[PDB]
Ligand SMILES: [Cl-]
């Protein structure tokens with residue numbers, strides 16, 4: 001599913017991501033924009049052989065099981081395929097664990113490089129939330 005910008009903001013809020021660990025909704029929407037362009041089915045293969053999955057490009061080295069990332073963990077206790085669903089529940093619940101892991105949203109390199117320090121509220125501007 002490719003979400004609309006406000007549609008995704010609303011879904012993230014519904015699932016308790018808004019201001020989670022102090023990160024406003026615009027941060028999460030911005031991260032999703034640059035990780036996946038709001039496409040739940042996004043996948044990308046990393047140089048180390050791991051793969052990133054879903055709207056927040058969650059990585060199989062630590063967070064989910066895909067059966068083909070040697071030496072990896074599955075800390076969210078989910079198949080990576082769950083992160084591709086039109087229902088963002090699994091992605092949100094896993095993101096909550098990731099952002100609580102110590103480095104906040106810096107876990108998402110694209111958030112650090114493209115969202116951090118910017119006017120992230122622009123991502124939820126105009127949205128009925
Ligand atoms: Cl915001």
Ligand SMILES: [Cl-]
Pocket residue numbers: 065066067068069070071072
């Ligand atoms: Cl594996």
Ligand SMILES: [Cl-]
Pocket residue numbers: 109110113114
């Ligand atoms: Cl980047």
